[model samples]
Target: RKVLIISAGASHSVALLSGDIVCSWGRGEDGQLGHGDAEDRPSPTQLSALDGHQIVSVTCGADHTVAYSQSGMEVYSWGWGDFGRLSHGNSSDLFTPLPIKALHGIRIKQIACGDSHCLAVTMEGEVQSWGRNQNGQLGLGDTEDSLVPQKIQAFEGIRIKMVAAGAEHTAAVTEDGDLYGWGWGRYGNLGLGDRTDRLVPERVTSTGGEKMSMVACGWRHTISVSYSGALYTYGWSKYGQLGHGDLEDHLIPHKLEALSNSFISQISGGARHTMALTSDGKLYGWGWNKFGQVGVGNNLDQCSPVQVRFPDDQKVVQVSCGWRHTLAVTERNNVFAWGRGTNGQLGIGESVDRNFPKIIEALSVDG
Candidate 1:
């Protein structure tokens, strides 16, 4: 099957194929690999437990995984269950994929996983969250954790089109393009004009009337794309992940003047880095580069957005970032990896880091 989409976690990678099959690799001591065992797979391996089900999407957290199967319109979760992150009514690690029975009948359209929390946007435009909430990432108006999915009442009557989870915060864009953020804000990751944690979703009123179309969260920062295709960043910037030409943290959304000319179509965030893909298939990276995760052929941290070079013939279509690595898929249906590979997270069949993009020969071979 041809790989259609990819996601990266702290030290693992997941891919969804055209046949709706899910594959995973890298660190799996906590069963994040979904191989029915706690063992690492240096290369992509199909999830046998979900073999018959048609998974429409897959997302990876720090040490857990989540998938939504279109066959039954259900959600499945596995991997580390600390703080009940798996939503199994208990904090016990799961070694295989298991259906989230509590949400069996709920038609979920999208799922987003944070370092220790999970968010789901139902087909009805409602939002549900579970797992760790010590910093209020669950948006349940409290800091207590939930072992089962709970509907977020704060979004009542508002159709949440999408949701993004960060290490300890959460952000969402409504059907009207209004943006809201809550949870951890010690570093202003919530874009609320102040570094204060929020238990309920609050409107981020700093876009100067710009309607947001997409949003992404890094470990301690947030990024969003406007309907007009402009990029905005805020929160922690110690590693330059904010792409604001400085290391100072931003308390509100700030447009990246450097990329003002590019119409960003997609965005992804790692632990302390960020990636953006323009409509023209151009890729730009910034922030931490200690392991060359920035993919700019260097190890220096970037303070602003910079083009990430790839083969002249290859046009990037999708991108994802791990804790210290990055992955991308080209228009030619080929996959490329770079940055930290010590745990085989790069899926290049080795345990070495790369300062530049390298094709994943195994997945790039034409069928």
Candidate 2:
């Protein structure tokens, strides 16, 4: 992985680094910073909690945080947990990342965080979910939420790779590169070509029936990138958030016409916008820009694709978008922020919204 962001929060942030080092700054309420404190910082802070280890990945939920490191090591979370979504068998707000003891001994590969819940896939081809299930997002065959990890009986014997969650639904990519989804299907996010929710995982068409290598989930939409650089999308399209070049809902995955030749290497979804990075290190985004979350230098929602600006020659290594703000890190550990800064989500020292990209030099890795 070249670059990435920790998305899925009222205000999102991400940690960027190459080896056993991590640098981050964003919303700190509930200690999303992983610094064991609840105070918001206006710049990048060296998450001391993650010191001395090579962090492979980091992701945020509405109020929770989770990270994955090399050596198959896994850390469960931190943040407000009124619903016991932390899977600690108790409801509480943890100000630091706590290795979920229940999953101790398991060689975890990936983790996904939903609005108030979480899911994981291990190296042994097993799938597990916990936390909020108000609408059966947990896929435990029931609508009751769980405070512990439960098996998704539907995928008991399948090898799983990537897992993701929306505001209420969940999706997983199997070891064979097939995408499967469940929960809150009323908006056709399940990609089964219909409007019905499922308590079990159902198959979503691969990128136009081709095998997929990646998939991403937003609050109400879904997207998948194929091995051939093809991108497909479906679900809520009211804000052109689906990136399907149209403003209508798609019950199944539709190819992103404009990005076909762009070499889309990876992607992530905001609650209303979408961001993608290319294999050559170029970044592009589309969808809602109400607070400049689109990073197009303006505060208007973009219904079409737009190039994300950087320092001209800076290659964006990673990108992450929050509910209304956006964060991206360049190839050289240079973090740039744009969009809504309210509550200190942008980590630029002030809460005022940014309509264009701003380099955050105030962030001190250990300050």
Candidate 3:
């Protein structure tokens, strides 16, 4: 099957294929795998919970999952719902996928999940969020968690093209390429030049008037890719997650001098690491590597961008990261994994941590 999208969560992995088919593996003690059981999967397994419906995209949180269906015009969520992360009007753990009734009529264009919250972008460019508001993650101007999804009125007029979530913050890009962020800012994840948490959305003016094409968040950091292919990073840098060549906290977005010449095509953030894909399909990574999540055949943390080597003919098409593990989809539609696999998040059918990338033989591209 041709791969369309892939998401690596805190300890689980989910992928959506060409036929809207979804397969997941890894920690399922919370039923995040949507396999009707809370058992960890060491291999790819079909999500029979959504057998009859077609999904356009899927995203995974720390212990929950969210999916969007174009035809249904609705969103489905399951797994750990503490603090109402599921947006199903309850805080019950749902082993099976259930339609979020509150969002039935809205046509969802995209979905994003943080360690404990969910965000959705509608066709009209409106944004709705729910779950863990203790850090103002919902951007509703309060710290009270909502049992149901709430529209973020601060962005009612601005057209949001996409949204992303970190462990306790949120960020989005407007249709005009303006970047906005809110929520937890202890580590400057909001890119607001201070440690003050934002109860409402604020424009990240440190981008020097550049139009951003994409943005991503790690556990406590944020990264943005500009329309001109330049990269900027901010927030926590204790493990060099900011890729600024040191463990210094950046109160503002800092440009990567080393990667300044590479025209990046995509960027992904893990709990404490970062990954980037260049235009020609080259994969570069840095930051925390305690479990070898960087896939550089070693466990040393990198302070700057380093190339993750593959065979000469191989080209990486996509990359995702869980709390500590790394996942990637190659041009040939093959999946590769490495790093922390204590819960089998690596999808290698083994509980061993791989210092280098390993192909997952269980998932067949043409199956």
Q: Which candidate leads in TM-score?
A: 1
lDDT of 3 at 275: 96
Candidate 1 lDDT, 64-146, residue by residue in tens: 88998766768898898875556468445688888898888788878999988999999889999998889999999999988
Number of the candidate with higher lDDT, 1 or 2: 1
Q: Which ten contiguous residues of candidate 2 have the minimum total lDDT?
A: 1-10
Q: Give the Å shift of residue 29 in candidate 1.
A: 0.6
The TM-score obtained by model 3 is: 0.97
> Model 2: per-residue lDDT, tens digit, 1-367?
2234445476646564555445445577776777788877666566777776556767788777777665646555777675555646644567777777667657777788878878888878787888888787888888987777877888877888888888899987887889888889888887889889878788885357688788888888887888788877888888888876678898888888888788888788889888888988888888888888888898877777788887766787777777888777777666677888877778777777896777766532211
Please give the distance, in angstroms, between residue 283's alpha carbon in candidate 3 and its true position after superposition: 0.8
The worst-scoring run of ten residues by lDDT in candidate 1 lies at 83-92
Taking every candidate in turn, the Cα RMSD to the unseen true structure, in Å, is: 1.3, 2.9, 1.5
Q: How well is each residue in 278-306 modelled by candidate 3, as lDDT tens digits?
A: 99899999999999999899999988888
TM-score for all predictions? 0.97, 0.91, 0.97
Better of 2 and 3 by TM-score: 3
| Clash totals, every prediction | 0, 4, 1
How many clashes would you count in candidate 1? 0
